[PDB]
Amino acid sequence: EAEAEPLDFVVATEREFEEVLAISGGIYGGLDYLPSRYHSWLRDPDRTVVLAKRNGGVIALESVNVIDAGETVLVEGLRVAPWERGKGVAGLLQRFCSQLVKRQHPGVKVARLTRDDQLGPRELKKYRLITKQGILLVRFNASALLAGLGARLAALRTSGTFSPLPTEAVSEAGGDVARLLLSPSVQRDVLPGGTIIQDWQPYRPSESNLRLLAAKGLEWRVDSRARPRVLTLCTRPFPIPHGGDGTWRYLNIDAFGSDGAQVQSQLLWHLQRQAPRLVGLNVMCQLFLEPQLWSQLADFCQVGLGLELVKGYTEQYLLEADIHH
Ligand SMILES: N[C@@H](Cc1c[nH]c[nH+]1)C(=O)O
Ligand SMILES: [Cl-]
């Protein structure tokens, strides 16, 4: 039997927040950002959050955000209510949103997205792979980490097993971020596929996008400002639904470059910076890094820092498709 009422595509408002939550159960195994981010999305000037409704009720959501100085649309948050899946809803929503973008933003040349599910024949046919990072997901209690870290490092030092390497400060206000990310050799030799990936969101390394990043409260670290080889980027932690008790936060660290020892030392630096703010809370900490460094960093986290690995190796794919007419 056909559905009694047709699909309607509308721009999201704060009124649908509770309805959007109701369709989002179980997404990303509890690491879903949208509960914490929905209200900020509605304020973003280049973003349109589209809801698919049937008979007045929300059944799907997609966000399109124009970035890269008008040349790219980033697709985020695609979701269909569990009870509406497998019927083509996501496909219809994607088509409405692509038509909307082409209508309102003729300058947009490509669509981009990130994902971590295995790529099948279909994906490789429709999308170009710009780059990929390995994904390392660990969990810890922030207070327990802080209470034990001193003794942990001290034993690692006296054992001759690990000592933190020197790292260098990166100030956005001071202009360090721009000097690094606008350097063509950093873009070629450090950034994955020449791209900034920040909490799953890809940006071409441009002054326009640096203004967007500057507003997010990010923390950066580098091995050497004069001779950059490893650059790391920590996104401010935010609440996630995991566990259902409100105590969990998601801490995203993107690591760019090939020197595993510096990824280790910079990871430690970010943990020492961020964990004091997370006292009393539980942390899903997800590190994105060059794939050939994953095993080194997984051992460092589990053996070195006593952190608990949440899942095995997976990959973050940055995918791109041309816009067509
Ligand atoms: N395309 C996904 C990327 C992602 C974030 N977290 C997990 N996956 C989204 O925007 O929701
Ligand atoms: Cl994967």
User: Which of these, 292, 265, 14, 299, lies nearest to 132 by C-alpha position?
Assistant: 292
Q: Which of 108, 123, 156 is the last residue of a domain?
A: 108
Distance of CA 125 to the CA centre of its chain: 24
Q: Which ligand is nearest to the CA of 34?
A: 1
The response to whether residue 223 sits with its C-beta less than 6 Å from ligand 1 reads no
Residues 208 and 309 both lie in one domain: yes
The response to whether residue 32 sits with its C-beta less than 6 Å from ligand 1 reads no
- Rounded to the nearest whole angstrom, what is the distance from the C-alpha of residue 85 to the centroid of ligand 2? 22
- Rounded to the nearest whole angstrom, what is the distance from the C-alpha of residue 324 to the centroid of ligand 1? 24
The response to whether residue 77 sits with its C-beta less than 6 Å from ligand 1 reads yes
- Rounded to the nearest whole angstrom, what is the distance from the C-alpha of residue 155 to the centroid of ligand 2? 34
CA distances (Å), 184 to each of 161, 204, 250, in order?
Answer: 36, 12, 32
The response to whether residue 294 sits with its C-beta less than 6 Å from ligand 1 reads no
Distance of CA 127 to the CA centre of its chain: 19
Is position 216 within any domain? yes
d(C-alpha 197, C-alpha 194), whole Å: 10
Residues 143 and 210 both lie in one domain: yes
Indicate the residue type of 75: V
Distance of CA 13 to the CA centre of its chain: 24
Nearest CA to ligand 1 atom 11: 77
Is position 31 within any domain? yes
Is position 118 within any domain? no
Q: What is the resolution of this structure in A?
A: 1.6
Q: Total structural domains in the chain? A: 2
Please check whether residue 62 is in contact with residue 53, taking contact to mean a CB–CB distance below 8 angstroms.
Answer: no
d(C-alpha 258, C-alpha 293), whole Å: 7
Domain CATH code at residue 263: 3.40.630
d(C-alpha 304, C-alpha 302), whole Å: 6
**What does the DSSP 8-state code read for residue 99?**
H
Interhelix angle 260-274/142-158, rounded to 10 degrees, is 140
Residues 143 and 97 both lie in one domain: no
Q: Which of 108, 143, 168 is the last residue of a domain?
A: 108
d(C-alpha 10, C-alpha 241), whole Å: 26
Is position 324 within any domain? no
Is position 323 within any domain? no
Place of tokens 């999308």: 127
Residues 143 and 270 both lie in one domain: yes
d(C-alpha 315, C-alpha 199), whole Å: 14
Residues 199 and 292 both lie in one domain: yes
The response to whether residue 37 sits with its C-beta less than 6 Å from ligand 1 reads no
Please check whether residue 107 is in contact with residue 167, taking contact to mean a CB–CB distance below 8 angstroms.
Answer: no
* Residue 114 host element (H or E): strand 110-115
CA distances (Å), 142 to each of 147, 204, 275, 280, in order?
Answer: 9, 33, 5, 7
- Rounded to the nearest whole angstrom, what is the distance from the C-alpha of residue 44 to the centroid of ligand 1? 17
Mutate to test the pocket of ligand 1, among 76, 132, 198, 250 (most ligand atoms within 8 A of CB): 76
Distance of CA 118 to the CA centre of its chain: 17
Residues 164 and 18 both lie in one domain: no
Place of tokens 């909490």: 199
Place of tokens 């608990």: 308
Q: Cα angle at 122 between 256 and 60, to 5 degrees?
A: 80
Mutate to test the pocket of ligand 1, among 44, 65, 112, 114 (most ligand atoms within 8 A of CB): 114
- Rounded to the nearest whole angstrom, what is the distance from the C-alpha of residue 122 to the centroid of ligand 2? 16
Q: Which ligand is nearest to the CA of 314?
A: 2
Residues 80 and 159 both lie in one domain: no
Domain CATH code at residue 103: 3.40.630.30
Ramachandran bin of 3, using left for φ above 0, alpha for ψ from -120 to 50, beta for the remaining angles: beta
- Rounded to the nearest whole angstrom, what is the distance from the C-alpha of residue 317 to the centroid of ligand 2? 8
Pairing state between β 248-257 and 47-54: unpaired
Pairing state between β 201-203 and 196-198: antiparallel
How close are the terminal C-alpha atoms of the chain, in Å? 33
Pairing state between β 128-141 and 110-115: unpaired
Q: Which of 108, 125, 146 is the last residue of a domain?
A: 108
What is the domain extent for residue 265?
133-317
Name residue 310's beta-bridge partners: none
Backbone angles phi, psi at 93, to 5 degrees: -65, -45
Residues 76 and 197 both lie in one domain: no
Helix (H, G, I), strand (E, B) or coil at 127: coil
User: Which of these, 79, 76, 74, lies nearest to 112 by C-alpha position?
Assistant: 74
Q: Tokens representing 142? A: 């922030």
* Residue 38 host element (H or E): helix 34-41
The response to whether residue 238 sits with its C-beta less than 6 Å from ligand 1 reads no
Residues 44 and 185 both lie in one domain: no
d(C-alpha 12, C-alpha 49), whole Å: 5
Q: Which ligand is nearest to the CA of 117?
A: 2
Name residue 220's beta-bridge partners: 170, 233
* Other CB atoms within 10 A of residue 178 CB: 15
Residues 203 and 148 both lie in one domain: yes
**What does the DSSP 8-state code read for residue 36?**
H
Place of tokens 């899942």: 311
User: Which of these, 192, 266, 252, lies nearest to 224 by C-alpha position?
Assistant: 266
* Other CB atoms within 10 A of residue 295 CB: 13
Cβ-in-10-Å burial (0-12, 13-18, 19+) of 188 comes to exposed
CA distances (Å), 255 to each of 48, 76, 170, 261, 264, in order?
Answer: 29, 21, 14, 12, 10
Pairing state between β 219-222 and 168-170: antiparallel
**What does the DSSP 8-state code read for residue 300?**
I
Indicate the residue type of 207: E
Is position 99 within any domain? yes
Distance of CA 142 to the CA centre of its chain: 21
Is position 137 within any domain? yes
The response to whether residue 76 sits with its C-beta less than 6 Å from ligand 1 reads yes
Is position 55 within any domain? yes
Helix (H, G, I), strand (E, B) or coil at 55: coil
Residues 170 and 247 both lie in one domain: yes
Please check whether residue 281 is in contact with residue 247, taking contact to mean a CB–CB distance below 8 angstroms.
Answer: yes
Q: Which ligand is nearest to the CA of 79?
A: 1
Length of the chain: 325
d(C-alpha 274, C-alpha 283), whole Å: 10
Residues 240 and 151 both lie in one domain: yes
